[PDB]
Subunit: 212 residues, 4 copies
């Protein structure tokens, strides 16, 4: 038996104030240092309980510990995508090109229609959660969905290439109740270079994971 | 605009009676032709609604239609893994080798501890759902978890390589309320060659999807 | 401290074969003796854990134990309503009169319209759960909703007066995947006298319970 | 057929700044005028959809509209209890006497142990939701549970008599990520007279609601 590899909190690809004016420094700081950090530690804690269980050292509720792992691991991986999905205005924002633009054109009828639908999905998440643009390994096509919490409505297979966090701690200090304005503004910091790179990996790698 | 590629019900990799005595023919037929088929149709129905929305032909509740897609797509992908995860006794069953056995040693301290943990996870799914063995792209290690329905507790990243369906329609006609006995018997039809192949692809393909090279 | 009052499995108001041909004996047996009994046992087990913790003997994951209580308690109370909601054909079935028929007319525009709405709610439960007719203490009106598992989508306030169990174990042995036919047949064993009494109590008790 | 009775936003039983310094004015204003109002509107919006469906004017996704009704009705009712559960310091805070204190002693072994269990419940809600003290009609005893969102984990029967909102919009502007300190401070505005009145109503009404002698 080998002790599990621990999850670690990544640094941001930019400073805490680098996404101003669209997302203020205080949100970025709390969101990274408190919230994302909590999910990293929570994922590790659940794996530690599994480890101690397997070593005959403690008793565990398997369902409970796996629910804890699920929520925290999902919080961690969604955030690991979220941060580099954004970039300071200039590098961030604008209109995508490349394969992402092509698929957006073919499936959603262009960037404006895609933007409206993605925005709708993000704005209408019930409670806290995420708006998600994903690559489907079964059809090699894009799909949009919502995730509640970090780990409800998410499915196997689908590869998130672009996500927006609509947990209240992602916008409340700046936009208060007005999630809609937050979502509208977030477009100005989308790192389309990152999304394109994610799509290219998915195009090469995703289908074979399930092809078998 | 071209819109969306449709999902299709795959055939089984074996005859409906091929997993007997462990899973009876009647279950395999209903499970495939009714349940799995419904998820395929449901996934396509949701995408058709999103299509009509994008054409300005209807206004949809986006949340509602995506919940429908999420449930039915998950049902479909989970079943696409479930069927080949199994094999008639002989090719199916027994103890694994290769890379899967290696990671089972490293992560769980051997097959017997892994089996006990996977079985507990499957037996104690609250309501209907799945026991899942997955490859974690972040650490390149195996993880076990439960999924409720098809789309609750599942996370991004994790790649299922071995799944057991513990929806009541997967066992009830044969094992009745005794999900425990169903889980114990299911091990006899596990296609470890298929699991090994999935792990091989995961080891090669999964990490770069999330941590960019 | 006084140790919690234990939950107990009630007997059926009728023999195991009394709802035939609409619900076969093997289902009634399994459903009552195995499934309902499990929820009684689960509810008590969760409270035993809470007690050991209150006595300071063990430390518990409060979230986990409360999730266990929620699911099993809900399973218990829903079934305590479910069994007397039904009655052997003759006592069960037919068309309601009295106060139930009256507000069915007021809220739903008649029995056939109510029936179609209730049947659809029951047939379309995603996964396992319940179709529910409830009384709303805030407006003194009837509402229909679904519950998933036993404890998802249910709300405070609403008092269930008529419930149908659409967990697969409630019908699979007889109807297989055909939940639709099960819902249709179930109408023939509905104890409208029981529903009438429940409504009467709700009319008298429910509103002066929340609005103060 | 008569059109449904509409839900209405009740005003606060105190000024928006009345729970200061424990809950700031801006939070009370936003929470009531924006968030609570939204649930009232959403609950009515769902009922209007059901009404048009019953009149045969539209064919609805029954599951979707009922999910909408569930969430928004729940948000409304939970808030209708939440607001009068609190009171400006003086009337609010301290420790309860009367029947609430008696039941707390018997079920939890005293206020100290109750406060510890309820605080733990509130602080550890996964995602957004509620800590709830409820009256059980089957046993006529108090029970503590969590509710996720407004409508997950809540059961039939159980009658909420004391609730704390731990959605992020209930504390974030003041306490930021520190939900723990919010929960600790919320005890100083609890309107125990209101809780007592709720318990008395439940002792008299709850059990005879599910009785059938």
């Amino acid at each position: 038996m080998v002790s599990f590899k621990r999850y670690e909190l990544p640094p941001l690809p930019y400073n805490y104030n680098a996404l101003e004016p669209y997302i203020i420094e205080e949100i970025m700081k709390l969101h990274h240092q408190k919230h994302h950090n909590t999910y990293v530690k929570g994922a590790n804690a659940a794996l530690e309980k599994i480890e101690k269980h397997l070593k005959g050292e403690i008793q565990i509720d398997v369902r409970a510990v796996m629910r804890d792992f699920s929520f925290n691991y999902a919080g961690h991986i969604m955030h690991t995508i979220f941060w580099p999905n954004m970039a300071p205005p200039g590098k961030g924002g604008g209109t995508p090109g490349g394969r992402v633009a092509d698929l957006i054109e073919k499936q959603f009828g262009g960037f404006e229609k895609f933007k409206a639908l993605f925005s709708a999905a993000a704005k209408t998440v019930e409670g806290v959660g995420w708006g998600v643009l994903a690559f489907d390994p079964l059809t090699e096509e894009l799909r949009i969905l919502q995730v509640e919490k970090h780990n409800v409505l998410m499915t196997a297979g689908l590869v998130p290439i672009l996500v927006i966090d609509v947990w209240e701690h992602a916008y409340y200090l700046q936009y208060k109740n007005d999630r809609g304005s937050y979502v509208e503004n977030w477009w100005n910091v989308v790192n389309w270079d990152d999304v394109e790179k994610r799509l290219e990996q998915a195009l090469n790698n995703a289908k074979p994971l399930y092809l078998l």
